[PDB]
Amino acid sequence: AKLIAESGSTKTEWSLVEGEHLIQRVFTEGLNPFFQTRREISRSIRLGLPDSFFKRKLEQVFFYGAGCTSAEKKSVVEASLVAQFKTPAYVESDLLAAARGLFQHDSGIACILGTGSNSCFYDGHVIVKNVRAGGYILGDEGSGAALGKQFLSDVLKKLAPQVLIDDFFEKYDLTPHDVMDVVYNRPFPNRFLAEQSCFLADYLRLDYVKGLLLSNLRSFFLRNVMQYDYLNYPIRFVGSVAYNYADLLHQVGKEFGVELSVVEETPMGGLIKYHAF
Amino acid sequence: AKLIAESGSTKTEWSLVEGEHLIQRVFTEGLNPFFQTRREISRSIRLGLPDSFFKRKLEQVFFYGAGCTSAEKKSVVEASLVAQFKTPAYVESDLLAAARGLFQHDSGIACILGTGSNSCFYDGHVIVKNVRAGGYILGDEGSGAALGKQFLSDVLKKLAPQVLIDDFFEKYDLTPHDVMDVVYNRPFPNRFLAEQSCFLADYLRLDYVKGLLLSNLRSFFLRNVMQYDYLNYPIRFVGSVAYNYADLLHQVGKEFGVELSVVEETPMGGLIKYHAF
Ligand SMILES: CC(=O)N[C@@H]1[C@@H](O[C@H](C)C(=O)O)[C@H](O)[C@@H](CO)O[C@H]1O
Ligand SMILES: CC(=O)N[C@@H]1[C@@H](O[C@H](C)C(=O)O)[C@H](O)[C@@H](CO)O[C@H]1O
């Protein structure tokens, strides 16, 4: 048996598979070594997963997570996985999951639009070019975190519509002071900012929300997608933001003169197909 | 004798005064209750200040600091001051220091452009309207933290001039991965981002830098200043970024049709004048 895990910072998708047949699917909280220590990751995995995962004999454990950028960061997750599963674990970027999941052994451009945002050029085996994500502060354009950051900024400065302001404070039972506390004082701020993508998904009628989405989606293209040879290679998307705003993403694509066809919610479906050889 | 202190997240200016005569002035590190606990601030004051401040008997303590949003946050700083000085302390926002320091008892609009950015309408007694700063993440347009946040974003995205990228990494001896840790893992990220404002001041000849300054300075006016009756009231700036980029700030001022003639480095000179009667 093999285990494939895909994390994006908000949720971690676990797939216990046999060849190509899925045995069990479980979701835990997101795993990111920029926001979690080795102890916190180990706790998350053990609390999140049933005992059935830690009982079944595993040959390899394939992990793809956000934050797994450097060797030091990949060591944190790996040592945590090895501790729990007693199995050689291969920790890679969630961007490689997006690449393998969307293309298998084909060439093109794989992108992520979820909690964070990332992009790469895939030749069919390895990532040739990769514009750095930068995290929720120094990047992640067109991501849920970027949407929420822009939204909450407008909420605090009363530049968003009143209906949105009132509905936000009612739904989350917060005050401006509390919003300040969650972002700066409470952990996983990137989750809370990204969580606002789900909130604003119901207000697609408002001009503000359309303007918020488009401007962020365009910002992703201009800074990430534009850097690649995008006019000659297929561009495929993965992520919650991509999936929920598939119409607006396709619109932005057409603005930059590209035809976005494949928009998957999770790259996991293709990862099982990929890890079947 | 009484003590006037002014903090802006990066540094704290201390003025020991009798009436309007300065006895001693010392700088320490910045005090922000969003980034520091009560025990951290107490240690910063105790070790930071000379033995001259503690042996001298004080009448009142006037403290204005960033992060002193609610009464809850002010109490943190207040408890620290009383524990050190053993004299009633008055903890307010640094925005009120800007208002009292620039206008005294006159009506107008006081603005801060330092590590963070803040704005208000001062009627000569109290702050009437206050557009929330939002902090370095959810606001602070045209601030030092905004400049650095945008610059380092471009650095990682390989969208900034190569001359700036190379000089940045050479100055700090950092790699892309290292910069990621300084912002996300290592404390006082807002300080490091704002410090990049000092860096970009050398390269004011580059079109990129001029374009980056003007972009942020306008964003401050658009989102903060223009919420007030700005065409019928004097606007006066204070802060390190305001002082350093006084030429470009005055440029933005004339573009919006206001005469920015008062730009100060610190509002301390006015606070010494204020606290006399
Ligand atoms: C440090 C951090 O959080 N970055 C992550 C990315 O992680 C990879 C490993 C990277 O750093 O390149 C991730 O691909 C995207 C999409 O989820 O979101 C970003 O926020
Ligand atoms: C939470 C925080 O850091 N905010 C501060 C402001 O603090 C006041 C108290 C406020 O938030 O109203 C400060 O005036 C400006 C300018 O220095 O910078 C912001 O970043």
Author numbering:
A (entry chain A), B (entry chain C): 1 to 277
Pull text from the paper.
The production of MurNAc-bound crystals of MurK and K1058 was very challenging but eventually yielded crystals of MurK and K1058 in complex MurNAc (termed MurK/MurNAc and K1058/MurNAc, respectively). Both crystal forms diffract to approximately 3 Å resolution and contain six protomers in the ASU corresponding to three biological dimers. An in-depth active site comparison of both MurNAc-liganded structures showed a very similar binding of MurNAc as in MurK, with the sugar molecule slightly tilted around the bond between O1 and C5. When comparing all residues of the sugar-binding site, differences can be found in two locations. Firstly, residue I69 of MurK is replaced by a less bulky and more polar threonine (T69) in K1058. Secondly, in the region involved in lactyl ether recognition, residues S133 and P134 are substituted by an arginine and an alanine, respectively. All other residues in the MurNAc-binding site are identical and occupy conformations very close to MurK. Moreover, R132 in K1058 seems to be an optimal candidate to bind MurNAc via its carboxy group. Although we do not observe such an interaction, probably because the side chain conformation would have to be in an “bent back” setup, a partial charge compensation is possible, which might compensate for the loss in affinity by the loss of water-mediated hydrogen bonding to S133 in MurK. Indeed, the affinity for K1058 is higher than MurK, with an apparent KM value of 28 ± 10 μM, but the catalytic turnover is severely reduced and suggests that MurNAc might not be the natural substrate of K1058.
